[PDB]
Amino acid sequence: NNSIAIPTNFTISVTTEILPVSMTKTSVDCTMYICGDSTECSNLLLQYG
Amino acid sequence: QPRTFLLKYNENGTITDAVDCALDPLSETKCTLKSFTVEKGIYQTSNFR
């Protein structure tokens, strides 16, 4: 309680943060992935809501 | 021709309006959104093949 450390020198330093904001705007068409131009499939696909 | 329409029924059960979902991109947005009202902007509505 009777001794204090006081700065005698300092450094002004710059650090770097890499902080993601966004990602790649993908899209997959579900019908295409599953059935493509398959007729029976495209129709049955509906029955799954 | 056996085309897809968005049908809107009134209280009686009579169709009072409809969108021909194969007519023009704007009509396609309305059938995608299930509304005869769209907001100002851009919508993804289909992936053509």
UniProtKB/Swiss-Prot annotation, chain A:
Carbohydrate-modified residues: N1, N9
Disulfide bridge positions per record: C35-C41
Protein function: Precursor of the fusion protein processed in the biosynthesis of the S protein and the formation of virus particle. Mediates fusion of the virion and cellular membranes by functioning as a class I viral fusion protein. Contains two viral fusion peptides that are unmasked after cleavage. The S2/S2' cleavage occurs during virus entry at the cell membrane by host TMPRSS2 or during endocytosis by host CSTL.
Protein name, as recorded: Spike protein S2
UniProt organism field: Severe acute respiratory syndrome coronavirus 2 (2019-nCoV)
Gene: S
